[PDB]
Amino acid sequence: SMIKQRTLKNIIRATGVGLHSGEKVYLTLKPAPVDTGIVFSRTDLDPVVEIPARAENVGETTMSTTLVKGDVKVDTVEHLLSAMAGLGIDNAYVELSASEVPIMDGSAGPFVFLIQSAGLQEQEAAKKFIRIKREVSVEEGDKRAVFVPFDGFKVSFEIDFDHPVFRTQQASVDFSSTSFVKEVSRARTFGFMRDIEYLRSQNLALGGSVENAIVVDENRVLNEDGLRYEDEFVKHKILDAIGDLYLLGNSLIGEFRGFKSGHALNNQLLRTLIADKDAWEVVTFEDARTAPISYMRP
Numbered sequence: 001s002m003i004k005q006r007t008l009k010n011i012i013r014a015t016g017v018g019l020h021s022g023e024k025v026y027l028t029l030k031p032a033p034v035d036t037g038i039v040f041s042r043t044d045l046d047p048v049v050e051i052p053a054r055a056e057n058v059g060e061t062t063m064s065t066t067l068v069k070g071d072v073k074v075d076t077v078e079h080l081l082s083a084m085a086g087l088g089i090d091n092a093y094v095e096l097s098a099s100e101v102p103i104m105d106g107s108a109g110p111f112v113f114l115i116q117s118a119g120l121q122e123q124e125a126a127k128k129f130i131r132i133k134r135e136v137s138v139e140e141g142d143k144r145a146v147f148v149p150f151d152g153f154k155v156s157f158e159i160d161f162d163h164p165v166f167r168t169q170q171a172s173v174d175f176s177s178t179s180f181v182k183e184v185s186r187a188r189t190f191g192f193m194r195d196i197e198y199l200r201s202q203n204l205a206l207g208g209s210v211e212n213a214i215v216v217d218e219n220r221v222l223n224e225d226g227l228r229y230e231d232e233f234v235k236h237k238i239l240d241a242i243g244d245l246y247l248l249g250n251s252l253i254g255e256f257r258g259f260k261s262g263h264a265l266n267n268q269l270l271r272t273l274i275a276d277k278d279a280w281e282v283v284t285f286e287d288a289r290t291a292p293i294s295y296m297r298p
């Protein structure tokens with residue numbers, strides 16, 4: 001029996017704060033039809049503005065992955081998009097009352113929980129996969145990001161901060177043994193005091209607190225109850241990347257490798273990949289028993 005596309009079983013309502021904006025935001029996730037993709041909606045505006053969550057719609061922001069259409073934007077989509085990729089949601093409307101997705105605890109945990117509390121619905125159509133056929137790589141100074149043919153899905157990442165707080169700055173997850181839910185989803189975004197102070201002075205990071213970010217001064221985590229994983233920092237880079245990969249609009253059959261990469265170079269990789277049609281093909285699986293990836297019950 002075929003790997004079928006999925007949407008939401010029921011609507012999800014949540015409430016939170018833009019990390020950057022400091023704005024209270026109301027968030028609704030709704031079932032969408034077959035071949036809809038993930039579509040973000042700014043419902044505060046008349047008329048309503050809808051931005052498909054696709055690489056064609058990424059803006060040239062420095063702080064997070066931002067979707068743009070005209071001078072309308074949606075900021076910091078990568079954590080939510082990451083939770084939908086984790087759970088294999090093809091189709092869903094994401095309604096927002098403000099410009100920025102709420103930050104929650106800084107991870108994809110809350111989003112995964114709400115989604116899985118609602119449960120998912122298999123739809124009557126083949127789920128489409130993007131299969132990496134060739135090596136696609138991009139560099140800029142010391143940062144590298146690479147796709148690599150792999151029968152399955154795996155993300156590998158390295159960061160290198162010259163900071164006392166680095167613990168493991170490397171990790172590799174194969175999502176056909178490692179559970180995204182258990183092992184990546186709870187990994188929080190992080191920030192250095194020096195950086196958070198500059199952003200504050202530029203009137204950015206207005207929603208940030210220990211409640212939604214690991215805060216790191218010179219030497220140590222300042223968060224009273226410390227870390228969730230020994231390797232949280234690099235595990236959260238894997239979270240951002242799975243989110244960024246999903247701007248492709250279908251789940252990936254292949255490997256990702258990031259070295260000190262962020263949303264900019266991740267976005268250069270998707271562009272180059274999309275552009276080089278020798279390097280990828282769209283595939284469906286009529287028999288899930290022989291697919292290289294498997295999914296949780298709905």
Ligand SMILES: CO[C@H](CO)c1ccc(C#Cc2ccc(C(=O)NC[C@H]3C[C@@H](NC(=O)[C@@H]4C[C@H](F)CN4)CN3C(=O)C3CC3)cc2)cc1
Pocket residue numbers: 063064076078188189190191195196199205207208209210213215236240262
């Ligand atoms: C002192 O108490 C106050 C209480 O009000 C306070 C104020 C502000 C904050 C905060 C915050 C905050 C700001 C920015 C970021 C952020 O930009 N981090 C980027 C990190 C993290 C990671 N990127 C991500 O996670 C992306 C970008 C967004 F974070 C979401 N996905 C990679 N990465 C790096 O490379 C860092 C070296 C720059 C973090 C926290 C706290 C308390």
Ligand SMILES: [Zn+2]
Pocket residue numbers: 078079189236240
């Ligand atoms: Zn992040």
